[PDB]
Short mmCIF file of C-alpha atoms in Angstrom, two decimals:
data_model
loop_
_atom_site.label_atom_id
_atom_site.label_comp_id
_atom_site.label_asym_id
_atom_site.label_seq_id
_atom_site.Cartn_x
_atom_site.Cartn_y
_atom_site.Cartn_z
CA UNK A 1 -147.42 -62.38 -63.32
CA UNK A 2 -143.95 -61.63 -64.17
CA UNK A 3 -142.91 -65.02 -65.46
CA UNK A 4 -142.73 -64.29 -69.01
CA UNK A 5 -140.78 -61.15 -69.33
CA UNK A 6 -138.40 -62.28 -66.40
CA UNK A 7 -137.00 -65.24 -68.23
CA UNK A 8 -136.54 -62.65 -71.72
CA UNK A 9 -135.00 -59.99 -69.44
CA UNK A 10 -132.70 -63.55 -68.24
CA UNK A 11 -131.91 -64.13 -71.54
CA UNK A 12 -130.33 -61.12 -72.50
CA UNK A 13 -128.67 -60.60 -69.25
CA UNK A 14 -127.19 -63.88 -69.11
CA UNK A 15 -125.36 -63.67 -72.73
CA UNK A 16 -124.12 -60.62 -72.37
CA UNK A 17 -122.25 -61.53 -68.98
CA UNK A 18 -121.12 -65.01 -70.07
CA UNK A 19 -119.27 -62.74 -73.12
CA UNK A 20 -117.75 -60.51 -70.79
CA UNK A 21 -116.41 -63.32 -68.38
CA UNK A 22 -114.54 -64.43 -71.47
CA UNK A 23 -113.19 -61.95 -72.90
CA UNK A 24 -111.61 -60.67 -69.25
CA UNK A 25 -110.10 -63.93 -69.60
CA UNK A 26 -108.10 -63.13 -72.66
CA UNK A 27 -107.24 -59.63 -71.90
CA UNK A 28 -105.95 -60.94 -68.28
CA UNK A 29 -103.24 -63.77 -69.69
CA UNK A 30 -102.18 -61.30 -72.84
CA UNK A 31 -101.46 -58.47 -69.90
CA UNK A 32 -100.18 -60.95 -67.77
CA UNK A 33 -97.59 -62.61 -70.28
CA UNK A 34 -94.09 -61.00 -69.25
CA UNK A 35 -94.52 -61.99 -65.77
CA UNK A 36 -95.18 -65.69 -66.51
CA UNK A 37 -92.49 -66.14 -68.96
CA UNK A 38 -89.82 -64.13 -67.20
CA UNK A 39 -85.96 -65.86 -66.30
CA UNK A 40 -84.21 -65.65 -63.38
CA UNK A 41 -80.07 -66.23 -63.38
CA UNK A 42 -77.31 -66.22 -60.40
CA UNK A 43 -73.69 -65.65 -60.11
CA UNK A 44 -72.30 -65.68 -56.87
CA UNK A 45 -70.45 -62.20 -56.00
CA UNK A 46 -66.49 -62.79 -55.40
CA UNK A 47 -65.66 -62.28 -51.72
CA UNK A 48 -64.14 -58.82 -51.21
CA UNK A 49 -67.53 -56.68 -49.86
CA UNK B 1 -63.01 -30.26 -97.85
CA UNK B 2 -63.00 -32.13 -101.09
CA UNK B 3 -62.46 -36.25 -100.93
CA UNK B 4 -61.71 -38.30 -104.22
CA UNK B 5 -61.86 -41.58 -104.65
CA UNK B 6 -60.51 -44.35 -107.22
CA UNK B 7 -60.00 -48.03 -107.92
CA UNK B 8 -56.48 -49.62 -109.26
CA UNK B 9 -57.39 -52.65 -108.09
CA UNK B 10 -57.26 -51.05 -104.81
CA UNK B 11 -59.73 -48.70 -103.55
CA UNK B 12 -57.66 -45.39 -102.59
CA UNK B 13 -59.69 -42.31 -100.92
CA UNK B 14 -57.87 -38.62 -99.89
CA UNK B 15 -59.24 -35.68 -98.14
CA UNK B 16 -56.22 -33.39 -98.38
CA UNK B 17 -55.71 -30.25 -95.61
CA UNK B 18 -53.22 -27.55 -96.28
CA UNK B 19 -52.98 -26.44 -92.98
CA UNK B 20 -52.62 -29.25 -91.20
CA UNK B 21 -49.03 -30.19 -89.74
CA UNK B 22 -49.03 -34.04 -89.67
CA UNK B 23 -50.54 -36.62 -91.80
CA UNK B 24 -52.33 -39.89 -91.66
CA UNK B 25 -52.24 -43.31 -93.34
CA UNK B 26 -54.32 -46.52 -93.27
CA UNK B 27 -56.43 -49.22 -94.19
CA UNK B 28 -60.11 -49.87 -93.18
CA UNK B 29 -61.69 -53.04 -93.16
CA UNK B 30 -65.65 -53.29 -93.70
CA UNK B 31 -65.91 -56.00 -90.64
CA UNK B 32 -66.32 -55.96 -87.03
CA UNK B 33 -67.96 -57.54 -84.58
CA UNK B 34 -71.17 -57.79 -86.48
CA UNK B 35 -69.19 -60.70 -88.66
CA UNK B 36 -68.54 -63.15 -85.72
CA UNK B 37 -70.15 -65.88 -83.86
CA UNK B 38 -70.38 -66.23 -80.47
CA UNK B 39 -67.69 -68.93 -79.86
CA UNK B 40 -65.27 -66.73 -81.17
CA UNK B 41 -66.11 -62.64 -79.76
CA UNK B 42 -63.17 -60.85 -79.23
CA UNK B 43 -61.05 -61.72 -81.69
CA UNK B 44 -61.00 -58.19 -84.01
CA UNK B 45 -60.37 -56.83 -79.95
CA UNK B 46 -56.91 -59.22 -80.17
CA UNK B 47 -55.55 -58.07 -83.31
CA UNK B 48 -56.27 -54.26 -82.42
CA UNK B 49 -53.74 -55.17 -79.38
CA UNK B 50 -51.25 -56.80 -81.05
CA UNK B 51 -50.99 -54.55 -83.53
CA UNK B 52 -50.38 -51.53 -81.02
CA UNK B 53 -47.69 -54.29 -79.24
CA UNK B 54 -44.74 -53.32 -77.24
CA UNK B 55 -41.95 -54.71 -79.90
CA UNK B 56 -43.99 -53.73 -83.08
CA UNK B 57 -44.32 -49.64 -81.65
CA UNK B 58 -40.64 -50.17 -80.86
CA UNK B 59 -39.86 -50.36 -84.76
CA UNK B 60 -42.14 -47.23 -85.24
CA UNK B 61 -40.86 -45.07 -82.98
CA UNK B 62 -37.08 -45.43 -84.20
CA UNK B 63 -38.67 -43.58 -87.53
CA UNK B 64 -40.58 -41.19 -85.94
CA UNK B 65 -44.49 -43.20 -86.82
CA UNK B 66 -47.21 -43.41 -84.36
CA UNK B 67 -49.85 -45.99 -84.19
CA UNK B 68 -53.80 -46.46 -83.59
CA UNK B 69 -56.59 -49.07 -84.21
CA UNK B 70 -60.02 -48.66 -83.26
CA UNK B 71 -62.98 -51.76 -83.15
CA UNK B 72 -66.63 -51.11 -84.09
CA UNK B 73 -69.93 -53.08 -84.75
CA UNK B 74 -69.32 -52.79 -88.66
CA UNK B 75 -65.83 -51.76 -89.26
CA UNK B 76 -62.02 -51.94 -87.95
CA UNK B 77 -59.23 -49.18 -88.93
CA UNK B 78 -55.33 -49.55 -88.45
CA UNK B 79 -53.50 -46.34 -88.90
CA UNK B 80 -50.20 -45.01 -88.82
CA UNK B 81 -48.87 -41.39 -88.39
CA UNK B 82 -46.37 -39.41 -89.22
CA UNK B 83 -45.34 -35.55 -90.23
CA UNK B 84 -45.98 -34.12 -93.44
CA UNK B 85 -42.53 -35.03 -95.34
CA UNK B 86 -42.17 -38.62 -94.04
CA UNK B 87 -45.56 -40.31 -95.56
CA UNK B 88 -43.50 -42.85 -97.60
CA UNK B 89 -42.09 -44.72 -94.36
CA UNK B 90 -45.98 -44.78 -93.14
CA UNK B 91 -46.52 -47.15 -96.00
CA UNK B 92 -43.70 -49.17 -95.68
CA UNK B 93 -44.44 -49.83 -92.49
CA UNK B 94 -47.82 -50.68 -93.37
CA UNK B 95 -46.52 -53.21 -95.75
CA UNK B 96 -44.64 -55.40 -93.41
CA UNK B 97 -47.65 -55.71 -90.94
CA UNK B 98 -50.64 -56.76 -93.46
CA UNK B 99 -49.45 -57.95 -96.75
CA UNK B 100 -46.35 -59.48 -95.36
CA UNK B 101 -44.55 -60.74 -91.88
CA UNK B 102 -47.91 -60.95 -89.69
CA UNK B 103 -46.60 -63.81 -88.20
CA UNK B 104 -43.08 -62.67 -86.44
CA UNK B 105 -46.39 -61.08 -84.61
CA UNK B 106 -48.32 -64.07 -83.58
CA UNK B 107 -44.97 -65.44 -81.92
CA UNK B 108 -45.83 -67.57 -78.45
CA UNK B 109 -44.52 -65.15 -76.13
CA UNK B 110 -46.41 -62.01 -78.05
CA UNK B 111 -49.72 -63.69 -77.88
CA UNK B 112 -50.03 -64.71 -74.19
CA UNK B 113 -48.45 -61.28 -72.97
CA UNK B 114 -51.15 -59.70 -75.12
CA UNK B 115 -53.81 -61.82 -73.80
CA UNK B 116 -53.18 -61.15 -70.23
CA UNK B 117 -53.43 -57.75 -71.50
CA UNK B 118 -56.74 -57.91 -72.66
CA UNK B 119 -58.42 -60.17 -70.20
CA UNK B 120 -57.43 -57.26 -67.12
CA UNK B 121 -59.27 -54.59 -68.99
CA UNK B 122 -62.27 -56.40 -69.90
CA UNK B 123 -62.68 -57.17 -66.33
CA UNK B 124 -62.20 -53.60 -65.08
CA UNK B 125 -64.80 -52.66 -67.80
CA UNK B 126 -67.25 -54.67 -66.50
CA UNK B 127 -66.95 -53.73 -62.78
CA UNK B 128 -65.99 -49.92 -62.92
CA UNK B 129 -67.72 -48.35 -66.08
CA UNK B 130 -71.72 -48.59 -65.66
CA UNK B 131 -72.64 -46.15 -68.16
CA UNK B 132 -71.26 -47.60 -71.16
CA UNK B 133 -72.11 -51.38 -70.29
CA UNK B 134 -75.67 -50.94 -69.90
CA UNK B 135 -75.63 -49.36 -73.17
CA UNK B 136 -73.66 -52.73 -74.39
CA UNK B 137 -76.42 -54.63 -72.46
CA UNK B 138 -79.05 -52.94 -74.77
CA UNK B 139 -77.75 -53.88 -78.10
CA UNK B 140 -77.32 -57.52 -76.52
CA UNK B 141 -81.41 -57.69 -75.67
CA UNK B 142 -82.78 -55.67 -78.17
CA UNK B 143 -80.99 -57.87 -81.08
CA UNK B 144 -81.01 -60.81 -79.30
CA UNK B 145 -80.07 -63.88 -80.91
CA UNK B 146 -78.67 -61.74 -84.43
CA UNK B 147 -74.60 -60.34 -84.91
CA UNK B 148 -75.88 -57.21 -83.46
CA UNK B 149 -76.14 -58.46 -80.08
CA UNK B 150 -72.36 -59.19 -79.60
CA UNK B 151 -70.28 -56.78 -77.52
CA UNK B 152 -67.11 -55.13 -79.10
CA UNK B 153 -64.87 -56.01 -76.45
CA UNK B 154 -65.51 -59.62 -75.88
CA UNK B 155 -66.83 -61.08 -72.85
CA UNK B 156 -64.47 -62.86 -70.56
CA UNK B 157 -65.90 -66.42 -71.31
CA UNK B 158 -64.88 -66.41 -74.43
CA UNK B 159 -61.63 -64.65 -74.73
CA UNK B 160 -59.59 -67.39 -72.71
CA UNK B 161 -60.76 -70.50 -75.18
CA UNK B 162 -59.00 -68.26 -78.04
CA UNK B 163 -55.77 -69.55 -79.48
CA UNK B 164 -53.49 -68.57 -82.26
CA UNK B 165 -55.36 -70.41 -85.35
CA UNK B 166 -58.37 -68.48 -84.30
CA UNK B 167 -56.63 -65.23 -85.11
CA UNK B 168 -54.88 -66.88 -88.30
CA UNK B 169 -58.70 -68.03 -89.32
CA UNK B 170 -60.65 -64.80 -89.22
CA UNK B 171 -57.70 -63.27 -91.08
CA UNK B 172 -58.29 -65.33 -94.15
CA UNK B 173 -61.75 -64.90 -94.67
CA UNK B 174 -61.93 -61.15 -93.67
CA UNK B 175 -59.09 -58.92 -94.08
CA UNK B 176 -59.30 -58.96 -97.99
CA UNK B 177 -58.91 -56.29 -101.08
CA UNK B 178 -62.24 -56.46 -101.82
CA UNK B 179 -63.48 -55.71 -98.30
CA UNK B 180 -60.63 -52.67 -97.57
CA UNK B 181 -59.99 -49.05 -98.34
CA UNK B 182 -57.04 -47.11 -98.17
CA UNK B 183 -57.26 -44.06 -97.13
CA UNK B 184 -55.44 -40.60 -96.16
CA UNK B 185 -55.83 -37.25 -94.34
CA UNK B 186 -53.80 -33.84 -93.26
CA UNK B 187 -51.34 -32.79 -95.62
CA UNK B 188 -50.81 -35.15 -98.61
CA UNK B 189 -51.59 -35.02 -101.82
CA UNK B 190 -53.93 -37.74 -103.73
CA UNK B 191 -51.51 -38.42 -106.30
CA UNK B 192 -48.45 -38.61 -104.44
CA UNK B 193 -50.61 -41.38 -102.49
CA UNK B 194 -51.75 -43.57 -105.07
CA UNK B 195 -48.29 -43.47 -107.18
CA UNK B 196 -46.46 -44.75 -104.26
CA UNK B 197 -48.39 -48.01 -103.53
CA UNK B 198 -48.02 -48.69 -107.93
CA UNK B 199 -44.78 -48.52 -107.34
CA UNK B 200 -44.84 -51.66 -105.10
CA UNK B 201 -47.82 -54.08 -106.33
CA UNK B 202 -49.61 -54.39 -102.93
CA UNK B 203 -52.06 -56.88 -102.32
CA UNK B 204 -53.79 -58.19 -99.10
CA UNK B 205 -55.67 -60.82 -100.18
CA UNK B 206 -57.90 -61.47 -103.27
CA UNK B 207 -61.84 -61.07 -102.13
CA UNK B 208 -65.65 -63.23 -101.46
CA UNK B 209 -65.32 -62.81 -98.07
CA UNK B 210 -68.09 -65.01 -96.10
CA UNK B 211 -72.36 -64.09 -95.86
CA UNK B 212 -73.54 -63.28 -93.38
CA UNK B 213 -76.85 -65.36 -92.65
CA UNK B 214 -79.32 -63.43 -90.65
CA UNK B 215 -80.51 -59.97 -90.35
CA UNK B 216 -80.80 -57.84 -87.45
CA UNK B 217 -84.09 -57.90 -85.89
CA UNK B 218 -85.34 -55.45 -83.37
CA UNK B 219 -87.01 -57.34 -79.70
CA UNK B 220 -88.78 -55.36 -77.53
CA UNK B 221 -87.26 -56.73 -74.06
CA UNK B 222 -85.44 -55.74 -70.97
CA UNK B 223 -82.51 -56.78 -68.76
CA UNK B 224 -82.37 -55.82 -65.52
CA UNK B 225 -78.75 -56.38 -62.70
CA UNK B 226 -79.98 -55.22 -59.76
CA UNK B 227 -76.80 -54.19 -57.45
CA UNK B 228 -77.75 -52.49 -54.41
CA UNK B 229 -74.39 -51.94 -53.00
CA UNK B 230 -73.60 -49.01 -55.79
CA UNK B 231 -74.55 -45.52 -55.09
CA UNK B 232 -76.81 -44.80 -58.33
CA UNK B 233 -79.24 -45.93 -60.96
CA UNK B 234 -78.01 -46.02 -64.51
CA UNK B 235 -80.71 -46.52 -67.24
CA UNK B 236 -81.01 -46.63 -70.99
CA UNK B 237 -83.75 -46.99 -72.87
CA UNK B 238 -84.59 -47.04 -77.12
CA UNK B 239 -86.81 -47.60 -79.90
CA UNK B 240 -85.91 -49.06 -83.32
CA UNK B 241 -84.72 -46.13 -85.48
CA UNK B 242 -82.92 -45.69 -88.79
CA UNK B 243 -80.02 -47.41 -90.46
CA UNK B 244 -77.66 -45.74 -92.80
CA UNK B 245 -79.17 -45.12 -96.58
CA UNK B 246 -81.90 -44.33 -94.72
CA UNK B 247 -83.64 -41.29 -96.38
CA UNK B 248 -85.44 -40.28 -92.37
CA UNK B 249 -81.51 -40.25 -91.53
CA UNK B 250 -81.08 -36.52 -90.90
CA UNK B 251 -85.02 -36.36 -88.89
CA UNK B 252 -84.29 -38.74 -86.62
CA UNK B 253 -80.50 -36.74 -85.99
CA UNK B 254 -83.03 -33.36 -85.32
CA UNK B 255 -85.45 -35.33 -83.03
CA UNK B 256 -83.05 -36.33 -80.76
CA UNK B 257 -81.29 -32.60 -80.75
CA UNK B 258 -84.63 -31.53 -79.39
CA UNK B 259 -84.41 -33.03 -75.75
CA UNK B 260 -80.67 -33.06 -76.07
CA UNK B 261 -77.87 -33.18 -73.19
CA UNK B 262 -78.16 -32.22 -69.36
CA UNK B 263 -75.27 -31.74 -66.61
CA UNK B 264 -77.68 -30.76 -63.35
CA UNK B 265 -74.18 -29.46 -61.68
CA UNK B 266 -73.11 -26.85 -64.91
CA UNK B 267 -75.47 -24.33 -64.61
CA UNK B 268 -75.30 -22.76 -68.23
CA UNK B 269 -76.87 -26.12 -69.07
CA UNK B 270 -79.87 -25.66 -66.61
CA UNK B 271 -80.75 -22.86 -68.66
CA UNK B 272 -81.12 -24.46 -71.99
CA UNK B 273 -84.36 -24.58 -74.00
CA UNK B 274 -85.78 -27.75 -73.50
CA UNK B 275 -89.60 -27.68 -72.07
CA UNK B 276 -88.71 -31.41 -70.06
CA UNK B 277 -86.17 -29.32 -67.79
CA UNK B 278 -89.22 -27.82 -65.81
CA UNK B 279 -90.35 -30.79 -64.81
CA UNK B 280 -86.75 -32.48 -63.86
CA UNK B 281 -85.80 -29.68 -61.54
CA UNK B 282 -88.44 -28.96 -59.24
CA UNK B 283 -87.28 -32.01 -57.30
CA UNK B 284 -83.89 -32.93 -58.98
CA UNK B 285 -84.81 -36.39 -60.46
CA UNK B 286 -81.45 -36.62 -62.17
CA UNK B 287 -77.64 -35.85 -62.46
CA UNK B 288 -77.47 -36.11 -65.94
CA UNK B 289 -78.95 -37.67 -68.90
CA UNK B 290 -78.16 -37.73 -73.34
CA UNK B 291 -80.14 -38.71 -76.02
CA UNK B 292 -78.96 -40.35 -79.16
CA UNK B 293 -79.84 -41.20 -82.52
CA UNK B 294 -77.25 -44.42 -83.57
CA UNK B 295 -77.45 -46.15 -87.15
CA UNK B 296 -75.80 -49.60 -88.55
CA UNK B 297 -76.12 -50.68 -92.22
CA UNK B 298 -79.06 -53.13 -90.70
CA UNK B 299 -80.81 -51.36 -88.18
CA UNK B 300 -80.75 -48.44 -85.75
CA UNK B 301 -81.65 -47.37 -82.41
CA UNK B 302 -83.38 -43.88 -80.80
CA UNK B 303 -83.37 -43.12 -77.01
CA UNK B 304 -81.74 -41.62 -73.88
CA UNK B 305 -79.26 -42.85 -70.95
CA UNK B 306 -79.31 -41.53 -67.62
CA UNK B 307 -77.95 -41.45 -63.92
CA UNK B 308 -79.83 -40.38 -60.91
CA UNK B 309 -79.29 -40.73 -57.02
CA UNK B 310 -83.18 -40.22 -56.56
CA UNK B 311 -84.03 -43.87 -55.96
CA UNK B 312 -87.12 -42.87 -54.42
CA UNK B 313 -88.39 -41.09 -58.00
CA UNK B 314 -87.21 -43.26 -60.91
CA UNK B 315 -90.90 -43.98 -62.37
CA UNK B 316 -91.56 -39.89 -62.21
CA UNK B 317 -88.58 -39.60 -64.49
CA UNK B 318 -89.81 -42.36 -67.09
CA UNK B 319 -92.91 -40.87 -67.13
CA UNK B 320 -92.47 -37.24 -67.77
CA UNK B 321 -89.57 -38.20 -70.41
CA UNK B 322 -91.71 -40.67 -72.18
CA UNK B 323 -95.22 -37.54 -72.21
CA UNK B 324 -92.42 -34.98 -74.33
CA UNK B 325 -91.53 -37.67 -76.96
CA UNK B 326 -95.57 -37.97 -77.36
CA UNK B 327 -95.40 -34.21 -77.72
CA UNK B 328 -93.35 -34.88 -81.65
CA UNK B 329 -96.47 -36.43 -83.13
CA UNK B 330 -99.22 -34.36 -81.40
CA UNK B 331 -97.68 -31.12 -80.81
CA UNK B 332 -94.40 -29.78 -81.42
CA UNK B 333 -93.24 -25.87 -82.08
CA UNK B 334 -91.83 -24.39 -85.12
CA UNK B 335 -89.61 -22.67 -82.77
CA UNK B 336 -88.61 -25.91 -81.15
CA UNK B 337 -87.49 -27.70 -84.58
CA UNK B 338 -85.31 -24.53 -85.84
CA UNK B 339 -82.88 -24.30 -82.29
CA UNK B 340 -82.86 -27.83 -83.30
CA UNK B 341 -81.45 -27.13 -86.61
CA UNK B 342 -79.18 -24.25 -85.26
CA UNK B 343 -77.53 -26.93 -83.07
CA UNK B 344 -77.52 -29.86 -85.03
CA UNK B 345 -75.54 -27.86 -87.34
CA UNK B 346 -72.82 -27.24 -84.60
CA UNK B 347 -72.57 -30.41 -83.52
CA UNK B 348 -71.88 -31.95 -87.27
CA UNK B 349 -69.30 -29.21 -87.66
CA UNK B 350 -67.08 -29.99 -84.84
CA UNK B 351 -67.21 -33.62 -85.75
CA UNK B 352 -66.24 -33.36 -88.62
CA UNK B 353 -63.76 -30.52 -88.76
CA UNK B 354 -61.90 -31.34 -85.92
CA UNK B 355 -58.06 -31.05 -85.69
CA UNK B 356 -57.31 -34.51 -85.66
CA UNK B 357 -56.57 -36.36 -88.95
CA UNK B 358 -56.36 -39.70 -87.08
CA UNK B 359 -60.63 -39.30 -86.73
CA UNK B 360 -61.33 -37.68 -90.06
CA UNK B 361 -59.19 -41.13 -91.07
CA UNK B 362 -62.21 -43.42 -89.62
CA UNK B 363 -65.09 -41.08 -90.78
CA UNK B 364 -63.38 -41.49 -94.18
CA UNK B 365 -63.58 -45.03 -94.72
CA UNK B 366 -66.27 -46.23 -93.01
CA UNK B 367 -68.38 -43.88 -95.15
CA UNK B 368 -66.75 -45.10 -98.43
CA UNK B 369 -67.15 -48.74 -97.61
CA UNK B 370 -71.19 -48.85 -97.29
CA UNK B 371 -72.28 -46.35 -99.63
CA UNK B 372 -69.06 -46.00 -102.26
CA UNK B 373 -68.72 -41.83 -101.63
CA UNK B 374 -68.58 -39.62 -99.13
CA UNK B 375 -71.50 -36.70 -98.47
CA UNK B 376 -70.20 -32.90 -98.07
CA UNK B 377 -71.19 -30.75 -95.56
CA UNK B 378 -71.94 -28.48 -97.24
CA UNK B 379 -74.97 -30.50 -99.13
CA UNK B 380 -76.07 -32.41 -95.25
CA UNK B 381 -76.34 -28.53 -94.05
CA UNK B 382 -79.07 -27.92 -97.23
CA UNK B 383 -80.88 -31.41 -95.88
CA UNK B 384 -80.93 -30.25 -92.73
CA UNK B 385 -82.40 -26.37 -93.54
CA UNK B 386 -85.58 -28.26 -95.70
CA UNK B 387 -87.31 -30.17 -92.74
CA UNK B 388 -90.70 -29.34 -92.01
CA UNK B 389 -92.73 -29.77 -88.77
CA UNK B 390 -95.03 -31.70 -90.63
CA UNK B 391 -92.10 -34.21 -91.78
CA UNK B 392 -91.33 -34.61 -87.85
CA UNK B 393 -94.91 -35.69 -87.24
CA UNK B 394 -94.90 -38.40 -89.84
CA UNK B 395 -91.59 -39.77 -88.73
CA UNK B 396 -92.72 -40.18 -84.95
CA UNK B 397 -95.96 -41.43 -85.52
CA UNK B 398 -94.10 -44.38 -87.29
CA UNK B 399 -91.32 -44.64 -85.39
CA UNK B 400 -92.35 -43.49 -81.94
CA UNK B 401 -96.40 -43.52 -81.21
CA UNK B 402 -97.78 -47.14 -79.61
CA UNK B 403 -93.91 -49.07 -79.89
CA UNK B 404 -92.03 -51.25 -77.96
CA UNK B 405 -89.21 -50.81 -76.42
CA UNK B 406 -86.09 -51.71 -75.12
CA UNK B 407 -84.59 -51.41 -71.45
CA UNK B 408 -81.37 -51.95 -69.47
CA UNK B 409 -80.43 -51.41 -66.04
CA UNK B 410 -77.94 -51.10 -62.91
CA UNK B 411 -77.59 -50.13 -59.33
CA UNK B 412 -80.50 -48.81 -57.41
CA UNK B 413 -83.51 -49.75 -59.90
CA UNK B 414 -85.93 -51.70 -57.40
CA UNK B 415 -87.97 -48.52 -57.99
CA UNK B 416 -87.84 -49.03 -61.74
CA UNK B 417 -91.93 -50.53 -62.81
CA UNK B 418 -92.63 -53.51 -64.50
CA UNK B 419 -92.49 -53.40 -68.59
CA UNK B 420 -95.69 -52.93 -69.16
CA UNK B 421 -96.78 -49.94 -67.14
CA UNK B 422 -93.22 -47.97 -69.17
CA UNK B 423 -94.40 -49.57 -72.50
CA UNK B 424 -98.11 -47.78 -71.85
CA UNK B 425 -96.49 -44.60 -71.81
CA UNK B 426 -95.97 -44.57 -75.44
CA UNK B 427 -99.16 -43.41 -76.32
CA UNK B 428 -100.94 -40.64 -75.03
CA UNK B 429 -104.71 -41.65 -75.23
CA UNK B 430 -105.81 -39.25 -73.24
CA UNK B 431 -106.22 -37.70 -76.53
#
């Protein structure tokens, strides 16, 4: 007896999530930017330690 | 004190002294080590050095002259000393060094000697001073890629590929009459100055020195050299501030007066009234620490260095630094901003009435040579006196609330967070 108003309730449920699974997706990688991009360098210490 | 300036061709600034018991003469150029390129850095640091040579202070000394030479971002000074009655051998001296005979000076033996000479102290600089080369190492990331960045010194890569025609070179195009200023302090007169150099038709060189292509431009960033055989952390860290002819010059000088200077092991200065000092010693997070306000005719930078031996509690003393600059947007005290005027005051004083004419000599003409006069004291103490709280508030909220930063580091600083969780600390929003 439920059939109608389950698949409206689905509806709404389903576009709201399938906004917020994007959007994490942007805020992740902007957050996550000075990790991904960052440079590593070496110069060997001169033996006298 | 009372300066005056004029132009004969030559641009010829006095501050005269009646009490003084010496006086000072030289020349100012308006280019340092903002006006070079990378291939060549350390070239204004070679000329400083062979100026102050062993055979050339010989040939002062027999007269009774003394000689100094200092190198900045935006300017470079060669000055020469003597007492009060003996001011006309200053400028002769001064004659045979600049507008004649600078190359008995660039002789083969003379340059390598001096090079030796400068290659051993950059080296000690970088392995024995930490305080004042991770303050080098944040003008280098902050204006990366601009003629900002460039370190005063030199670095040691590029001081050994320099040869004789590179010092000839940046002569040419840089040490010019329409890019110097003459200048003179302690006892001696303004007219007796200027008569004596027309009575010898000086000349340096004619003018158009080169342009200069790009600006400086402020990059939030951070370098970090991790060393974990040295005994401490040392940190700086800054904003983008004010350059000179800036008219927020004298707010951003009070802002920093605020949080001021600390020395944990004086204990007059444990005492002082600075509201981030009861957070700092409950558990000693640092030895020291000094905040500054520095300006360029491009750009400027506002922040604080420190050194700790608390390795353990480096991202407790980010954090409660960062929550009192905050405090200059939100909520700062009336009585907090006049101490800071009270102090500020000081501290301009003894800068600028000092006893030494060889300082009041660089003051002089690097003033002169970016805005054409010198400012009183007496009119920057009337500045000072008419700032508001509410003019405080509008500068930080510009200048200060939800901006990035730069960072440098040494020593100890695994404990030091990632950029991010320092760069949230800007803003409150728990607000």
């Amino acid at each position: 007896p439920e059939h109608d108003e389950r698949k409206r309730l689905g509806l709404k449920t389903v576009i709201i999530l399938s906004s917020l699974y994007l959007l994490s997706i942007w805020v992740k990688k902007f957050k996550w930017a000075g990790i991904k991009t960052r440079k590593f360098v070496f110069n060997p210490p001169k033996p006298r330690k | 004190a009372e300066v005056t300036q004029l132009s004969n061709g030559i641009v010829v600034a006095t501050e005269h002294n009646p009490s003084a018991h010496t006086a000072s003469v030289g020349v100012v150029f308006g280019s340092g080590a903002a006006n070079e390129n990378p291939y060549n850095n350390g070239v204004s640091n070679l000329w400083k050095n062979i100026f102050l040579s062993k055979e050339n202070s010989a040939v002062a000394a027999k007269e009774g002259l003394a000689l100094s030479s200092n190198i900045s971002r935006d300017f470079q000074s060669y000055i020469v000393s003597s007492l009060p009655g003996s001011t006309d051998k200053s400028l002769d001296f001064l004659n045979q060094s600049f507008i004649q005979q600078k190359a008995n000076l660039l002789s083969s033996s003379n340059f390598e000697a001096t090079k030796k000479s400068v290659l051993k102290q950059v080296q000690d600089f970088e392995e024995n001073d930490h305080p004042n080369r991770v303050l080098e190492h944040l003008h280098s990331t902050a204006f990366q890629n601009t003629p900002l960045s460039l370190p005063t010194r030199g670095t040691l890569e590029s001081l050994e590929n320099l040869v004789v025609a590179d010092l000839e070179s940046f002569a040419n195009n840089h040490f010019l009459n329409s890019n110097a200023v003459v200048v003179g302090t302690g006892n001696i007169k303004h007219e007796d100055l200027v008569n004596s150099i027309e009575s010898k038709n000086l000349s340096l060189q004619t003018g158009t020195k080169p342009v200069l292509k790009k600006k400086a431009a402020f990059l939030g960033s951070e370098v970090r050299l991790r060393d974990d055989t040295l005994p401490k952390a040392w940190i700086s860290l800054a904003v983008e501030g004010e350059p000179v002819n800036s008219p927020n010059y004298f707010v951003a000088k009070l802002a920093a007066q605020i949080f001021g200077s600390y020395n944990a092991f004086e204990p007059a200065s444990r005492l002082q009234g600075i509201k981030l000092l009861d957070n700092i010693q409950e558990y000693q997070l640092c030895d020291n620490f000094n905040h500054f306000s520095l300006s360029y005719k491009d750009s400027g930078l506002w922040g604080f260095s420190t050194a700790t031996r608390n390795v353990t509690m480096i991202d407790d003393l980010i954090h409660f630094t960062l929550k009192q600059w905050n405090r200059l947007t939100i909520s700062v005290t009336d009585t907090e901003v006049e101490r800071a005027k009270s102090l500020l005051k000081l501290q301009l004083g003894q800068l600028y009435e000092s006893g030494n004419p060889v300082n009041d000599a660089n003051l002089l003409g690097a003033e002169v040579l970016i805005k054409g006069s010198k400012l009183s004291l007496g009119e920057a103490f009337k500045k000072i006196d008419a700032i508001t709280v509410k003019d405080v508030k509008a500068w930080a909220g510009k200048r200060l609330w939800d901006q990035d930063i730069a960072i440098a580091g040494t020593g100890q600083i695994e404990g030091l967070l990632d950029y991010m969780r320092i760069r949230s600390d800007m803003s409150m929003m728990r607000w």
